[PDB]
Design a binder for this molecule. Structure first.
Ligand SMILES: *[C@@H](C)[C@H]1/C(=C/c2[nH]c(/C=C3N=C(/C=C4\NC(=O)C(CC)=C4C)C(C)=C\3CCC(=O)O)c(CCC(=O)O)c2C)NC(=O)[C@@H]1C
Ligand SMILES: *[C@@H](C)[C@H]1/C(=C/c2[nH]c(/C=C3N=C(/C=C4\NC(=O)C(CC)=C4C)C(C)=C\3CCC(=O)O)c(CCC(=O)O)c2C)NC(=O)[C@@H]1C
Ligand SMILES: *[C@@H](C)[C@H]1/C(=C/c2[nH]c(/C=C3N=C(/C=C4\NC(=O)C(CC)=C4C)C(C)=C\3CCC(=O)O)c(CCC(=O)O)c2C)NC(=O)[C@@H]1C
Ligand SMILES: *[C@@H](C)[C@H]1/C(=C/c2[nH]c(/C=C3N=C(/C=C4\NC(=O)C(CC)=C4C)C(C)=C\3CCC(=O)O)c(CCC(=O)O)c2C)NC(=O)[C@@H]1C
Ligand SMILES: *[C@@H](C)[C@H]1/C(=C/c2[nH]c(/C=C3N=C(/C=C4\NC(=O)C(CC)=C4C)C(C)=C\3CCC(=O)O)c(CCC(=O)O)c2C)NC(=O)[C@@H]1C
Ligand SMILES: *[C@@H](C)[C@H]1/C(=C/c2[nH]c(/C=C3N=C(/C=C4\NC(=O)C(CC)=C4C)C(C)=C\3CCC(=O)O)c(CCC(=O)O)c2C)NC(=O)[C@@H]1C
Ligand SMILES: *[C@H](C)[C@H]1/C(=C/c2[nH]c(/C=C3N=C(/C=C4\NC(=O)C(CC)=C4C)C(C)=C\3CCC(=O)O)c(CCC(=O)O)c2C)NC(=O)[C@@H]1C
Ligand SMILES: *[C@H](C)[C@H]1/C(=C/c2[nH]c(/C=C3N=C(/C=C4\NC(=O)C(CC)=C4C)C(C)=C\3CCC(=O)O)c(CCC(=O)O)c2C)NC(=O)[C@@H]1C
Ligand SMILES: CCC1=C(C)/C(=C/C2=NC(=C\c3[nH]c(/C=C4\NC(=O)[C@H](C)[C@H]4CC)c(C)c3CCC(=O)O)/C(CCC(=O)O)=C2C)NC1=O
Ligand SMILES: CCC1=C(C)/C(=C/C2=NC(=C\c3[nH]c(/C=C4\NC(=O)[C@H](C)[C@H]4CC)c(C)c3CCC(=O)O)/C(CCC(=O)O)=C2C)NC1=O
Ligand SMILES: CCC1=C(C)/C(=C/C2=NC(=C\c3[nH]c(/C=C4\NC(=O)[C@H](C)[C@H]4CC)c(C)c3CCC(=O)O)/C(CCC(=O)O)=C2C)NC1=O
Ligand SMILES: CCC1=C(C)/C(=C/C2=NC(=C\c3[nH]c(/C=C4\NC(=O)[C@H](C)[C@H]4CC)c(C)c3CCC(=O)O)/C(CCC(=O)O)=C2C)NC1=O
Lengths: 172, 162, 162, 172, 162, 172, 162, 172
């Protein structure tokens, strides 16, 4: 897999170039925001249960046929499997956030996943909706100004939202 | 690519779990040292041509015969000196790669692998490049922890040639 | 599905033989206890709504904070109380399933599997449901062996949460 | 596999319903007839040899070419195999009778059996005739009023006949 | 030894667990059938001598050559009559063992094992003992489920000879 | 292993004689009290954790160095191991109670247990004390006249106590 | 035992090599976080008794039946109150162990292992201790990364009970 | 294995009490000097070959029969094996230095080493001398005040020397 530094270094090696001041400054910004990035990762993992819970609640309100008899999340087995998928996608999003690059999310999670869902009979659009609602809950937890040194985390927040939207577009 | 961050993530993934507090502490250590790492990388990239030419000249002075003896593997003409500056630039560039990535991954994959066969085939004495690296180590002008980072990766390059 | 009858038949089939006198004695025991089993199932199904609402209220009294604290996992509004009555109904319905089948199969497959992850994810304290089951156990109004059957399957539900 | 209780419980679980008084009363009737059901199973197993014998006798009278030279039940090997098939089908019928549901009979015996016979060259119609004659002999043994507390077993008898007819229709 | 109770206990001990409700139902089936089993055992033991002698005479009436032909394996003299009475006594004794134990264990262990080679070596026709057991079945004076149990294990002995 | 019927049948087979009327009467009394025996086994298994808890509470009250630093049951590891031991011994006692014979308890649980405990440094005397307290709690729960039909269970209680004392004497 | 330092050393020793710069970065992450970890440990140890008593009273206020119902597993009398205070003290003591060690090692080893069977046997509801740890988290008086570390390991204890 | 924190936590768990303020203060001082400790480990590992070379030079100067025909370090094989031994021991000393505890050095390196050397005919006394000379070279390199921030590393130097003398005493 790659992190941000590894992606820049691989692209540089392919061209046989030293890093340009653009790339140097970008990676220096990553290094200086490292503490906020660790804060985002820690806040997402420490509240993974609540993120999954809020997303699933909003989804099941929006699509109640999911949790009624005949629904695709009705029995205990299907419900637990659905929550497992939610936490899996969230875990790979946290991986991508720590890495600063979506390589691990695509290669180890998103690839072939739409085909897997369409073979299992799981509504990919509903999974994508749940992923978006996970995005909303996770951004709400990340930007919560309580108990943290005040600052601007809008760049990290947009990066995390991009990872979530990439996850959602891979199954819809 | 092998980096401390990617190793942390792969350890988390093998066990199918979220990142533990220990792995977060490790990645925090990487981030904390990355200030010195990027300082050293920026310095070595700005002073690129100066350091390359100075190291070439250091090798030439330390080994005078490389500017006198005829032969394609020596630097007695313009072609040899261009090739030598290019080689030293390769070394320094990959060292900056390692400094940026935070580990020996780039040096292991982009430089060291196959280096011995390249040197044996073209009759390039590794001690030439050891001396070039020693000059770069003694004349980057860095101080403190950026100097220490640059030194560890230059030394890692030196050990591969030894 | 795992039932005593299906287990007897599978034991007979693995050895490719007819049902032995021992397996007939076992199935006779199942049939003999099935009178109390069906009595308890019919009672728990008729008094369904009464027992569900009584158990919800028992949990609310025993744990007053579940009717006061704000939060989606609590029952401080109408949505929470509807969800809680629905959960207790799920528990009771699957318990009647087990009573009908004559074994823990329905409880193992339809309720207990994945229950811990459901409770951890949505922050539903298992002790709430333990108290609900204790109320249902103390207020089904059954006597004798039907009471004993209902009690064994309610207790099996309790042990899963413990 | 399923027994009667398991089938009703699975159908209830799929709909997310409590059992209706219909299903409760049906299963209570099964429980109260349990003793007669055990009597039917015990009488069929304890006289499996005589059931197979009477059925095969009637069949071989009806179709004598089966046990003449060139017949499909002529040699000792073929005859023993035919009796083995008779006892196999009877054993799975007894399974279904004890279970109060034909699931074990279909899944572990009847499925793919017509294809197996047509690949082996065994006359499926003759097997079906023998199965019907087994049905007649087994009902005669079940309804025999001697040595048993007198009562009505007509419901069990129709159930057993349905299992036998299901077995016969799977090979004809 | 192989009894229903020991089999249930062994099933529970293999899984290193307490006894389940299914197993308790099966053991209750054994206990409920044990009333008839013990009545049949008591009857067959009290009327043991009458049953043995009647069975021997039934064998003689059905196969008269056994009383007529000379040879050690026949009952033409008193020694043969006594050996045959002893044999039928062994059969009945072990059938009562099985009624007591509640399974075919004692019959599988004390009688049927090696029975075939015993009868082959001493030229004893199994149909003799089949007829003796048929007489015992027809003349034990039991009615109902006690008779059903006695006939279950007597037919089990009959099928071991066929 | 043996149950009561199996032990009597083995002793009668080794002598080659029919069961005397005494043995028949004893086993018929076992059959008559079978429902009481099932009640005892059911109450002891479904209250197993309560029995272990009461015994352990008493044992730690009178030997408090067991749950104090340096005690053989202080840490979570050794505490859980002691509770596992008591639940194991109670389980084998319920086995013997269902069987009406101590052979399973002797052969599968008690034989060699004192050697195990003295090789481990586990004080066998306190294990025996805990077993006796398990006996007291179990008999209290079995003799509880509520929720059950009134009757005499003194013989069954004495048999269960004999099993408990056999267990306590095998490690004391 | 399982500490970040011991894990790095074991990784280096498995490959029979000196410590790498990645491992030294990870150990530096541990050392930089250890300041907050030690501040949190010191605070929780100094205010140990106040925190224990406050957590017990919070449990009582939230689950009042624990002070009212008779039975050995409750805190209706002084013995129960003292047992509960001792338990919360064990929890807090081991949480400080983990803060000192810098990992979940002590919590995995000294508390969580066997905790489930302990609580099942003595009928102690895990939600009691969850509420106690929530109080401790809300009342340790730490601010910043020391509070973050304390809450990390307290939530680790909370999730072991859920 | 143990580090300093782990050793203290084990000794406090075995007594069942919180850490006294003394132990807290000692471990906090370890944390404060952690950067010095990392400096010592880094300097000892990145100068390992120089340390081994200096020690070996001194050892062969004062015991020259080691590198003379018939000496236990004469041929290329035995010379390389001696250098491997010294690098191994220095590596385990750096392990103990990072851990702040000698448990790894004792358990994984020193335990049984004297028996190995005397079975091999390797003179343990000269091995101990070489270890002491490694100590001198390593401490010289660690205390070098150039290229580093001025400060007191006397406690760390004493700890490292204690590890070196523990190693030398295990083979002497
Ligand atoms: C964006 C999510 C919010 C935000 C972020 C923010 N945090 C800090 C300061 C610090 N964050 C850390 C975090 C960690 N260090 C570690 O080792 C680990 C893993 C174990 C973590 C998670 C630290 C140490 C600091 C410094 C001390 C402090 O508390 O300040 C800042 C300010 C400093 C900086 O940005 O570099 C910011 C901005 N603040 C918000 O308002 C966002 C909602
Ligand atoms: C229908 C096949 C015929 C019939 C059935 C019938 N039987 C009974 C009464 C009883 N049947 C049993 C049978 C068993 N108990 C066991 O444990 C086992 C397996 C080891 C068996 C096979 C028992 C115990 C009884 C009760 C005692 C008795 O003999 O009565 C009845 C009457 C009671 C009822 O139906 O519940 C009936 C009707 N009678 C016929 O005429 C049919 C031909
Ligand atoms: C409380 C009762 C006392 C005590 C108990 C204690 N036991 C052990 C460890 C072991 N216990 C057993 C016993 C059995 N294993 C079996 O399979 C069976 C029956 C089939 C039995 C009876 C064994 C084998 C062990 C060692 C292996 C293991 O732990 O599984 C311990 C742990 C001792 C230790 O960790 O060093 C303890 C503490 N402790 C007390 O204080 C009470 C007197
Ligand atoms: C001494 C322990 C107490 C006592 C025992 C007692 N039990 C019964 C009667 C019954 N016990 C049961 C329980 C079961 N039957 C089963 O098949 C199973 C396995 C699932 C169980 C658990 C049953 C069904 C009966 C019969 C129905 C009834 O309610 O009686 C009695 C009654 C006397 C008898 O032997 O029939 C007694 C006395 N009763 C006490 O008061 C003692 C404290
Ligand atoms: C110089 C220091 C002295 C000396 C050294 C010498 N050593 C050996 C051979 C061996 N050395 C070891 C030691 C270790 N193996 C391990 O794994 C570890 C730590 C985990 C240690 C400390 C062993 C096991 C051997 C034997 C197997 C091997 O060689 O790998 C030799 C070679 C002896 C021979 O070839 O006969 C030598 C020469 N020699 C001197 O003169 C110095 C006093
Ligand atoms: C005694 C050995 C000599 C001494 C030690 C000393 N070191 C420091 C301060 C620092 N040392 C480092 C080195 C590292 N930090 C890391 O995370 C890693 C792993 C990659 C390493 C190798 C760092 C970063 C610092 C802080 C920055 C700085 O330049 O100070 C000090 C300073 C005092 C302190 O404890 O902070 C000292 C004294 N200095 C000497 O003069 C001794 C000979
Ligand atoms: C300068 C220190 C001394 C020296 C230089 C010299 N080098 C070469 C020719 C080659 N150098 C390389 C090295 C690399 N190519 C790679 O991709 C990498 C990895 C990043 C390395 C390290 C190679 C492969 C060649 C041959 C092919 C090529 O030209 O690229 C020469 C020319 C020798 C020749 O025969 O062409 C010279 C002169 N010689 C001196 O005297 C300097 C002291
Ligand atoms: C009542 C005892 C307490 C309580 C109730 C409560 N429950 C929920 C939400 C959910 N309950 C479940 C449980 C199950 N679904 C199944 O299929 C099965 C197996 C049969 C079980 C056990 C689930 C999955 C959810 C979430 C999804 C859904 O709504 O179906 C809530 C709502 C929490 C939320 O975030 O939506 C509540 C309030 N809370 C209390 O305070 C009562 C004391
Ligand atoms: C590491 C990468 C990885 C991924 C991504 C993954 C997903 C995944 N989800 C599955 C099932 C499932 N996934 C769901 C989820 C859903 N049902 C709904 O109604 C919702 C829309 C949604 C929850 C938000 C369900 C219900 C199943 C079970 C399907 C079934 O049993 O019929 C399955 C196959 C069956 C199973 O394992 O249970 C896979 C492989 N497994 C992996 O290893
Ligand atoms: C558990 C489910 C199961 C079934 C159902 C089963 C049936 C079965 N019967 C077979 C053969 C046979 N079956 C018959 C039976 C018949 N011939 C006649 O004339 C009659 C119509 C009829 C007797 C009523 C014969 C003769 C064979 C042997 C075919 C041959 O040898 O050519 C064979 C393959 C060859 C063999 O095994 O001997 C199978 C698999 N085996 C199983 O395991
Ligand atoms: C429980 C296991 C067991 C069995 C089954 C058993 C049977 C048995 N019966 C025997 C003899 C005999 N059994 C008979 C009985 C018969 N001949 C007739 O004509 C009658 C019709 C028929 C009675 C049904 C006779 C006549 C002998 C003596 C044959 C001889 O001595 O060669 C013998 C030869 C050894 C001996 O004399 O004891 C054995 C082993 N012994 C055992 O330990
Ligand atoms: C560190 C590993 C470890 C743990 C976790 C531990 C817990 C523990 N708490 C116990 C008792 C107890 N714990 C409580 C506490 C509670 N009851 C209430 O109502 C309160 C709300 C609640 C406090 C949160 C009580 C009342 C008891 C006594 C119950 C009894 O004696 O049966 C017991 C039974 C043995 C004894 O008395 O010591 C154990 C093993 N012991 C250990 O070595």
């Amino acid at each position: 897999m790659l992190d941000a530094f590894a992606k820049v270094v691989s692209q540089a090696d392919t061209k046989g170039e030293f890093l340009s001041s653009a790339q140097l400054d970008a990676l220096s910004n990553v290094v200086k925001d490292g503490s906020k990035r660790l804060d985002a990762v820690n806040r997402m993992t420490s509240n993974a249960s609540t993120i999954v819970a809020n997303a699933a609640r909003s989804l099941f309100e929006e699509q109640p046929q999911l949790i009624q008899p005949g629904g695709n999340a009705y029995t205990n087995r299907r419900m637990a499997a659905c929550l497992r998928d939610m936490e899996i996608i969230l875990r790979y999003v946290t991986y991508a956030t720590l890495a600063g690059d979506s390589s691990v999310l695509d290669d180890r999670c998103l690839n072939g996943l739409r085909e897997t869902y369409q073979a299992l009979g799981v509504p990919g659009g509903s999974v994508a909706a749940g992923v978006a609602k996970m995005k909303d809950a996770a951004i709400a937890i990340v930007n919560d100004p309580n108990g943290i040194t005040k600052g601007d985390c809008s760049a990290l927040v947009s990066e995390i939202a991009s990872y979530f939207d990439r996850a959602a577009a891979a199954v819809a | 690519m092998k980096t401390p961050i990617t190793e942390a993530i792969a350890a988390a993934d093998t066990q199918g779990r979220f990142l533990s507090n220990t792995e977060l502490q490790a990645v925090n250590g990487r981030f904390e040292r990355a200030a010195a790492s990027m300082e050293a990388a920026r310095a070595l990239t700005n002073n690129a041509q100066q350091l390359i030419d100075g190291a070439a000249n250091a090798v030439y002075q330390k080994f005078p015969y490389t500017t006198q003896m005829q032969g394609a593997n020596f630097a007695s003409d313009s072609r040899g000196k261009s090739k030598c500056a290019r080689d030293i630039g390769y070394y320094l560039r990959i060292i900056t790669y390692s400094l940026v990535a935070g580990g020996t991954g780039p040096l292991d994959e982009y430089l060291i692998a196959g280096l011995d066969e390249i040197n044996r085939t073209f009759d390039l004495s590794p001690s030439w490049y050891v001396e070039a690296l020693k000059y770069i180590k003694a004349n980057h002008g860095l101080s403190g922890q950026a100097a220490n980072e640059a030194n560890t990766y230059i030394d890692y390059a030196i050990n591969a040639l030894s």
